[PDB]
Amino acid sequence: AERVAAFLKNVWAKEPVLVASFAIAGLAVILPTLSPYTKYSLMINRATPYNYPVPLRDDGNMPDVPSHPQDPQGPSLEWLKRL
Amino acid sequence: SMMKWNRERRRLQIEDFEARIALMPLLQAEKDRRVLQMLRENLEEEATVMKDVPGWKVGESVFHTTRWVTPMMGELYGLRASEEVLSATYGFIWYT
Amino acid sequence: MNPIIFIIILLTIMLGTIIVMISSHWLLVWIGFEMNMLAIIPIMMKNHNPRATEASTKYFLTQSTASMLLMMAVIINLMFSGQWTVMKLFNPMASMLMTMALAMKLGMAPFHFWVPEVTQGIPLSSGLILLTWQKLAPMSVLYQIFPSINLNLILTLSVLSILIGGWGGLNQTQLRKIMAYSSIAHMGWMTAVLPYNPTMTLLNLIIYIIMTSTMFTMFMANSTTTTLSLSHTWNKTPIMTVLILATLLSMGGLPPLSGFMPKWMIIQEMTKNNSIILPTFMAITALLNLYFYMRLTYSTTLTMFPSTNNMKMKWQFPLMKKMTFLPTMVVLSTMMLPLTPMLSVLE
Amino acid sequence: MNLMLALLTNFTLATLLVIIAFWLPQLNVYSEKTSPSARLPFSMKFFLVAITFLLFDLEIALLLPLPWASQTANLNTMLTMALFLIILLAVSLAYEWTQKGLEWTE
Amino acid sequence: MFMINILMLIIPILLAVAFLTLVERKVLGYMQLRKGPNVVGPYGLLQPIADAIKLFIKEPLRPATSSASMFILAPIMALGLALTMWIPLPMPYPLINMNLGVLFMLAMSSLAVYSILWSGWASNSKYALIGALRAVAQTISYEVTLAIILLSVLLMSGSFTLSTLITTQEQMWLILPAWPLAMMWFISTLAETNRAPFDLTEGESELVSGFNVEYAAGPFALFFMAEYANIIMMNIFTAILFLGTSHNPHMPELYTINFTIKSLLLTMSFLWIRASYPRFRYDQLMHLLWKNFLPLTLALCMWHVSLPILTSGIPPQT
Amino acid sequence: MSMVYMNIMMAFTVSLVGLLMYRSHLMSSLLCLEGMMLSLFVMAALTILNSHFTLASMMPIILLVFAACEAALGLSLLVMVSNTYGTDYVQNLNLLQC
Amino acid sequence: PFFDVQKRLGVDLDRWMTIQSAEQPHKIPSRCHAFEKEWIECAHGIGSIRAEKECKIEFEDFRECLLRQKTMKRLHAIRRQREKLIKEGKYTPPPHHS
Amino acid sequence: PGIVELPSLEDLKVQEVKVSSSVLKAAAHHYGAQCDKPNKEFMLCRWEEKDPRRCLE
Amino acid sequence: MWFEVLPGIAVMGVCLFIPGMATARIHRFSNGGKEKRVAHYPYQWYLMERDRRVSGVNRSYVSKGLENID
Amino acid sequence: MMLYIVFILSVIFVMGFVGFSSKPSPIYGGLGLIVSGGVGCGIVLNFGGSFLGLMVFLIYLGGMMVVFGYTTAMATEQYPEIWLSNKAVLGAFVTGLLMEFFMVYYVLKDKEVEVVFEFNGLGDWVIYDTGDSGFFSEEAMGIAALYSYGTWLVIVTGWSLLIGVVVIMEITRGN
């Protein structure tokens, strides 16, 4: 509208500190939901190994579990090297 | 600039954490032998010291269960010099 | 107070109690008590006078001391059980501390001195919250830890509360002090039956709240806080004197009124457990409360005390106080005895 | 051990400087001179700034773990609750501000 | 060996404070078209020594104190805490390497307000106590922004370890991503240390500011040393926090030289500011904190919690 | 129990006795109330830290926060009492006797 | 809980912190994890009246892990006996232990 | 209660790896790749057995 | 002139430079010419204690390499 | 003697408590509590609670106790009676230190005392954990979990603090 724009003019003239404060806070609450790289923050936190990775007893039918760390199977960190 | 550098630091952290993981089996194997030796040594001195105490069973457990229980500091260093005990107990907390 | 802020504060008083009632963790129970105490202080202070400030201070000191003892009991319980679950306590010292802490919060004798003074020093609406809603959280905790409570301790607190409440009320002319001692006496019935059947603790609590709420509401309707100011009601609102009479007889536990029901059901449970002496002593001692309820009925409804000339001016104006739920409450306070088996919904 | 030694040394020296600051003037032997609770009255405003500092300071205690909290896998929950705390800290300020809790005029 | 290290920190601190008094008078002098001390020693280099001797052999003031124990405790606390603030600082290596060194510095500075309170209590004067309480209210108010600003910067560093701030700024000074926080941080340090234009303890609006008023006080020198040690320390902390110096493990002295220059320049800016502006009113500096810095600091804290998450730039934990 | 618990439990007991035995200043009794919380904080922290109850590590903070908030409320009441009477003496808080 | 709203709605408000053998950050175990697990599983479902009798062995071991009262009694006996013999010169510490 | 069973000192004797942590850190990545099999058997034993006495071999 | 302010600043600069230089040099003196080991977490302290045992002289900063292998 | 640092600190902890619990003038009562708080933090540090210990200094000493001393100056004391110059204050102080001294005497001599609970006097170090080699601080991990595990705790704690601001403004307005 134009009533809305006039109001934004009056505060920007009288209370620039508060206008900046509400603008910065608004970005803080909105941008994370819109950012495409937010998903990588979760992935990186899950790629950090704080605990020993306890091995599994090989019953004989876990095709997707590697037998050696350098085998192809298992989660890769290729995306992280490029990121 | 902060984003790129913090991404690289996260990659460096994973490298450091994976070096630890590679070494944990060796460190675990040593720790187990060290703990078991100290307990065996305490037991030998218990047999000597408590030889004439009436009713004493040497090496008796205080738990009903026969499951392995991690010893507490007193059980491991109970009969030892104060310097080693002090280092084992407060050395990490007091290091700078 | 800004009316919106008054609403938020009341909702926080309720939230604190609700947190106590839904928590499975001792820390959250403690937080609920802390939140409740914080929110109730303003409603006690709201009329700004030295008496309201003294009552708020006396209440704060009593409740804060109780809450520290509660936390001490929780921590001792953690040391001896390694867990936080709201349930039976695992150490007899923790049990004693928590029982005493909850007795202090309830105002049970011999931790009772604050109840008459705090009630007297605050408005009628605040006293209504203090003597009804504030009992819910401590009772809900006692309801869950009772298997670990020392039997002698809890019964001793009950007997003393019935004795002190009965004797304390005999010497009172202030309505708020009468309701405070009546609350102390009724508290002893609730805890006396708790070891045997906690469901009857809930029954007595619900009926006590309804009758107490009815009394405060009728006192608020005419802005009466003393016996002699209540003695003018016959010459202003005669119907109110009849309603006051019925409720006071009900609080006295007289058949066939509703207030007999909790006394009747508690006596039954105690006798099933071969407790004969204690219910007989409690029933007899409750005659003290009936006496100073009956004294009020004499000055309010059954005789006509002298009026004043300026009372004629009041005849020309209507009652404009809300008196919320009063018609429903007064009926429940008096005419519920035929529906006594409905107490099983509390099981 | 080192931290204890440092604290002991720092406050030991401070103590020695204080006592010699009080004794060294007595070397002069200056002449003798022979020539010289309750409210304050305290303003409520000065009490209310101290209380506001405390309540704001307690909310800061809850925010201090944020650097560690960001290492979690449940980032969406963590970020929601972090912004929730800071916003309630802002709401406390807004309430104080709009009821003239931040004024100094009598 | 460690005892040598402590003394190689304490003694130079006291000497820097002594000669900062000379630098302040000469810098303020030249900004005022004059010289400042240039008679007592060449270029006034002996002036700090003459002042120090003079103060310590001066007669103690009157009147007598209201509390002897609090009268003695306040200067001990002020100076003891001032020196303690230096022990975790990485220059580039700290005397005490704390995992929570930043939190240690926050905690110790929050205790510095007690010397103000105790010296007001021991002043035996109603008006002097009221002056102390106004000073405390100023100090604690600006502690709020320092803590929140500090928390916001650490969200880019990742820990409370002071030496981790060095690693965080290996590529770039934190002042670039965080100049709005640096601005408010720098002013808060001025207000925290009661420096102009926030030096109301030395102002004209206090009930005790009148020249002919008297109350128990002193020793002046010890309180003065404690204050100026905090000025230097805050500016050292400011440099580490926002102007991180590169550290070469094989040439640590290069870090120290570059790090010392930045701290000196920041300290000189305190003197620069004192020469340039009038003094705030007490209600106006409260308004600056509660109605300007604090709303903006809360907003920037929200931003700096969100920014690393949405950019995928969360720093490491270790 | 371990030896330290004896002293922490003594400290709580001492501050509780100090709380229940008033003198004159209402302020002196509030300090005993805060002393009680400090001993609870220490005993809670020792139990939780020694047992490695990881998620309970946050409990001492919540204790401290809620107790400080309750101490702010207590101090506010003390100031209102001091405004009415000019001192924080508890012997002036005896109107409700009648 | 008095009102078990959590179970009805299936929302975990505070159960996550009630016991030390629940899920912890980074799978850090409490020191007495095994004992608490065994006591909880023994007593599960049977009610507290039965559990106070039929899981006494598990609870006694769990309590020993928590407060180590019997372990410290046994250590004190050995240490008391040892210093008695050193006073009488009838025992000598080995090279290790020094 | 029973007697806690402990292995003899001779049963605990092995040739130790007497190198410093910096040596171990430097070799850690190759050591992790080359010695994975015996290391992972040991760690599977320790987590399954929950008893150091059961994994000494 | 303004450059007569520098001598007092130089004295300040030398005083502020000394604590940082001293700590670095004393650390290398006390840890065999190397940086003092940083142990913020139990794992790092665990390795430092192991080095103290491995050294054979009870100093964690005495490093043993492949010469100890056999 | 450094191996009994925790016990020695806890003795000082009790002595400080007897300090302000005998209730001298509020000015010195605050001093006893401040010293007790500082010693209290020291005990927590020696159990591995570095963050918890520093919270005491930052929030309890730098926050709550500053406000207590602030309020004491304005509303309570301006000058104090000499510490231990009153009959009851000194008698209470002497009584407390005698009880503490005897508890310490018997616990050290018999290595065990019994009051309500059974206490062992071997030394607090004997109960410590013998396995530590993680790459993080467990205490810090538990506190950080407030924002992931403790959503409900944050809400009620946040609500209580906000209500505290509102309530205290209500209480102090005076009308």
Ligand SMILES: CCCCCCCCCCCCCCCCCC(=O)OC[C@H](COP(=O)(O)OCCN)OC(=O)CCCCCCCCCCCCCCCCC
């Ligand atoms: C259901 C099973 C359970 C059974 C339990 C018993 C249920 C009864 C209890 C119900 C609750 C009490 C409400 C009873 C309604 C009372 C109605 C009434 O008494 O009239 C009021 C009357 C009107 O006065 P006024 O305002 O002037 O109006 C004039 C009318 N044209 O006011 C007056 O004129 C004043 C009267 C003078 C005072 C007389 C005092 C005696 C009153 C006797 C009735 C009270 C009964 C309560 C005790 C229970 C009895 C068993």
Ligand SMILES: CCCCCCCCCCCCO[C@@H]1O[C@H](CO)[C@@H](O[C@H]2O[C@H](CO)[C@@H](O)[C@H](O)[C@H]2O)[C@H](O)[C@H]1O
């Ligand atoms: C080994 C070192 C030993 C310590 C040596 C300490 C030497 C101290 C020398 C101080 C030199 C004079 O420095 C100057 O002193 C006066 C105090 O009179 C200060 O003056 C300031 O404080 C006083 C009050 O305290 C105010 O009245 C005055 O208006 C204000 O400007 C100046 O801000 C300062 O620049």
